[PDB]
Amino acid sequence: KTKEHLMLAALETFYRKGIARTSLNEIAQAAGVTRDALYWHFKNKEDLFDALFQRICDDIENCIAGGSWTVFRHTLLHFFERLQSNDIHYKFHNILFLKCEHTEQNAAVIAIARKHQAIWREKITAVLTEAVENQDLADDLDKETAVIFIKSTLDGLIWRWFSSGESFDLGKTAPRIIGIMMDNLENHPCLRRK
Amino acid sequence: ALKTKEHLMLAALETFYRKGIARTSLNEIAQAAGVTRDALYWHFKNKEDLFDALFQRICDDIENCIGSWTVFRHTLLHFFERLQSNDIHYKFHNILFLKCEHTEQNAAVIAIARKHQAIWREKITAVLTEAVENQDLADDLDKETAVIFIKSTLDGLIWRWFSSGESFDLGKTAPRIIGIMMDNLENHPCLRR
């Protein structure tokens, strides 16, 4: 896993300079290896970022591994918890929201982040579908809008926290926001596929 | 005078949109404006000045579009409507959320964005203040958490819309995100003290 030393060098350089302004060179340097050594494991700055994204998901699943709806709750609380206690999770999301501009110069990286978004949307859809089946959520729940509503809510909190310089207690705020979101998903008529 | 400042301002908005704020240079803006470096400097010394003025143009449009709780609802609906129909608003917020990295190289511009967040917090705290007094909201209301709630809700919808490459119908989506948000403010227990 000389890959991890490399992934961390990138994660560390992305955090400091932002993705667009970091080159494989500096990443190789920061990692103390050669360009060819790096290239052998990662052919791009985009693959490194891709690897980080994947590492982040792996962690989330390894942790998730009564009622799937109730476990979704903990998974969400557990996410904001480590978003603040885990360094790799803190830096990665900070980079994603605050240091990854949507310029043509970054299109490749943005395409990568785009497939991962798709991955989470699919995963949220599965949670919703299962919650319905187990009757934790109403049968006429508008799943399409629910997913958008869920991502919107969580992304909003993350953006708000990082963008304000962490000017508010995430440990106390997230639970509240999560409880309101899940209550809305269970009871609010606006989220019904009426 | 005001028309020339407006030409330079929109020229900056255009190049910020095209390649982000960090990469945009005063020369590039000047070239895009067709003016000279000195002429641009005459109205705006730096990028943070163009950006700050861009912020004001936006804050002026929301305000010069004017129960306090009902107006507030209308202000939010209007806001998302023009994020779709108004070119200045579409790009400014797109730049704010997707092309304004928080690096040491943009510290000055972020500083500006931060003073504007502070006022928005202010505007909203006052809206919440009349609401409780006019009984549109409970005395029980946790104003501090409420403001964060309001900002994170709106910011998520915006980021979500821009990030997804506008993959969903903002006109259909925003009225409901706002509707749910307002119901929460009024009735949810987790927003109380």
Automatic annotation (TrEMBL), chain A:
Taxonomy, superkingdom: Bacteria
Glycoprotein is among the record's keywords: no
Signal peptide interval: none
Gene3D superfamilies the UniProt entry points to: Tetracycline Repressor, domain 2 (1.10.357.10)
All copies of domain HTH tetR-type, residue ranges: 1-60
Database matches in SUPFAM superfamilies: Homeodomain-like, Tetracyclin repressor-like, C-terminal domain
Annotated GO MF terms: DNA binding
Residue ranges for the DNA-binding region feature of this UniProt entry: 23-42
UniProt keyword annotation of DNA-binding present: yes
Keyword terms: DNA-binding, Repressor, Transcription, Transcription regulation
Protein name: MtrR
Organism, scientific name: Neisseria gonorrhoeae
Taxonomic lineage from the root: Bacteria, Pseudomonadati, Pseudomonadota, Betaproteobacteria, Neisseriales
Gene name of the record: mtrR
Automatic annotation (TrEMBL), chain B:
Keyword entries, A-Z: DNA-binding, Repressor, Transcription, Transcription regulation
GO molecular function: DNA binding
Domain of life, per lineage: Bacteria
SUPFAM superfamilies from the UniProt entry: Homeodomain-like (SSF46689), Tetracyclin repressor-like, C-terminal domain (SSF48498)
Record flagged with keyword Glycosyltransferase: no
Record bears the keyword ATP-binding: no
Record-annotated DNA-binding residue ranges: 25-44
Residue intervals of the HTH tetR-type domain: 2-62
Family annotation (PANTHER family): ACREF/ENVCD OPERON REPRESSOR-RELATED, ACREF_ENVCD OPERON REPRESSOR-RELATED
Protein name: MtrR
Underlying gene: mtrR
